[PDB]
Amino acid sequence: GSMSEQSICQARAAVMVYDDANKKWVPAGGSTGFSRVHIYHHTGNNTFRVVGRKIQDHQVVINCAIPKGLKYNQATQTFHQWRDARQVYGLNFGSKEDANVFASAMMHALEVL
């Protein structure tokens, strides 16, 4: 059930997607602002996903599988990004610590997939 899926990291970040047509970053879910972003581990099938919800109103702005082999790119010390088939995601972290802790947890997840 639900309890077999566990959060293994959370951080504060503004979630963005790249508008491939207009060549600009846009807020995930339509409104710019900070979200609480988790990496969840489904222990039964050993899969991971990233889920983020806006802090002010809990809107779900990202719910993204993390497949085996995903390339997680640290573009700057506070902006990280990865590819999904439908769009590129970016996380603008609220602090360097948020970014580094999230990235480490992501790299650990990628190495156990």
Ligand X SMILES: CC(=O)N[C@@H](Cc1ccccc1Cl)C(=O)N1CCC[C@]12C=C[C@@H]1CC[C@@H](C(=O)N3CC[C@@H]4C=C[C@H]5[C@H](C)C[C@@H](C(=O)O)N5C(=O)[C@H]43)N1C2=O
Name the site residues for ligand X (rule: CB under 6 A).
Answer: 2-3, 5-7, 18, 25, 28-30, 40, 51, 60-64, 71, 73, 75-76, 79, 81-84, 86-88, 92
Could you tell me if 30 and 19 are in contact, meaning their C-beta atoms sit under 8 angstroms apart? Answer: no
Q: Shortest distance, CB of residue 97 to ligand X, whole angstroms? A: 18
Residue placing its CB nearer to ligand X in the complex, 43 or 104: 43
Reported as half-sphere exposure (CB side, CA atoms, 13 A), residue 73 has a value of 8
Q: How far apart are CA 58 and CA 74, in angstroms?
A: 26
Q: How far apart are CA 72 and CA 33, in angstroms?
A: 22
Going by the DSSP 8-state scheme, the letter that residue 110 receives in this structure is H
Q: Shortest distance, CB of residue 42 to ligand X, whole angstroms? A: 9
Residues in Cβ contact with 10 at an 8 Å cutoff, skipping those fewer than 6 apart? 36, 37, 38, 39
Q: Shortest distance, CB of residue 94 to ligand X, whole angstroms? A: 12
Q: Shortest distance, CB of residue 73 to ligand X, whole angstroms? A: 4
Residue placing its CB nearer to ligand X in the complex, 69 or 112: 69
Residue placing its CB nearer to ligand X in the complex, 63 or 104: 63
